[PDB]
């Protein structure tokens, strides 16, 4: 009777309210996301324009569906050739389900050891950046479509990720638990992975401001609404 997106929201609320019952609830939530299709959200797949992106439009947009104190639920829509740059989710669980298109998701974690003095990167770092670089581990980098299962991240594993739209636009549904809360110490930090002068392998990470060419704007969510 209830729409699939309402059932997902309900199950997310039960799951994220590890306490007893959490794994069975998380498994049921993943099984619901595995069934989700773009049409269940009234989102038609978007295909490439083959035109350059003008400076006034954002590379990525976001449709909000619902949020509680326990989780946030929405859809990111990436235009051709865009990314959500490498970022973390402090103390946070996250799920992602591709709705259309193909994304490449690179998954890493922060490992603190000092950079060895002889160590060298290309492009070279400024002195303040050499002091700030920290070790990380690159755990996976694979492509996902709507036929893949959901991708999961936790506070302790795969907590850093980068999402690239592959050969055209792509969109995914995300669940984040708890949501970000900058006033409470849970913000979104961006990072650069540095190339010195396969998986899992050790890398070097540099926290960095949000890129000048990345931002995300809201757009209306067209699908069935989540009701209290």
């Amino acid at each position: 009777m209830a729409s699939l997106i309402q059932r997902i929201a309900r199950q997310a609320s039960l799951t994220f309210r590890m306490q007893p019952g959490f794994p069975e609830n998380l498994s049921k939530l993943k099984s619901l996301l595995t069934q989700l299709r773009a049409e269940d959200l009234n989102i038609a797949p978007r295909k490439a324009t083959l035109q350059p992106l003008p400076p006034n439009l954002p590379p990525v947009t976001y449709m909000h569906i619902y949020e509680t104190d326990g989780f946030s639920l929405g859809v990111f829509l990436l235009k051709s050739g865009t990314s959500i740059p490498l970022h973390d989710h402090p103390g946070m669980h996250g799920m992602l389900k591709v709705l259309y298109g193909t994304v490449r998701i690179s998954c890493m974690d922060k490992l603190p050891r000092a950079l060895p003095p002889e160590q060298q990167f290309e492009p070279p770092l400024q002195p303040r950046e050499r002091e700030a670089v920290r070790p990380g581990v690159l755990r996976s980098r694979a492509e996902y479509t709507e036929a893949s299962g959901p991708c999961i991240l936790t506070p302790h594993r795969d907590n850093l990720h980068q999402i690239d739209a592959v050969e055209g636009p792509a969109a995914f549904l995300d669940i984040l638990a708890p949501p970000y809360d900058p006033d409470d110490g849970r913000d979104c930090h961006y990072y650069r992975v540095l190339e010195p002068v396969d998986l899992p392998r050790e890398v070097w990470l540099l926290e960095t401001p949000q890129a000048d060419d990345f931002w995300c704007e809201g757009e209306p969510y067209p699908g069935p609404k989540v009701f209290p």
Binding site: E67, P179, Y180, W215
Partner: peptide, 14 residues
């Protein structure tokens, strides 16, 4: 401008 969002934290929305 900076907006505090549930989905991307402190986000520069421009």
């Amino acid at each position: 401008y900076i907006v505090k969002t549930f989905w991307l934290g402190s986000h520069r929305q421009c």
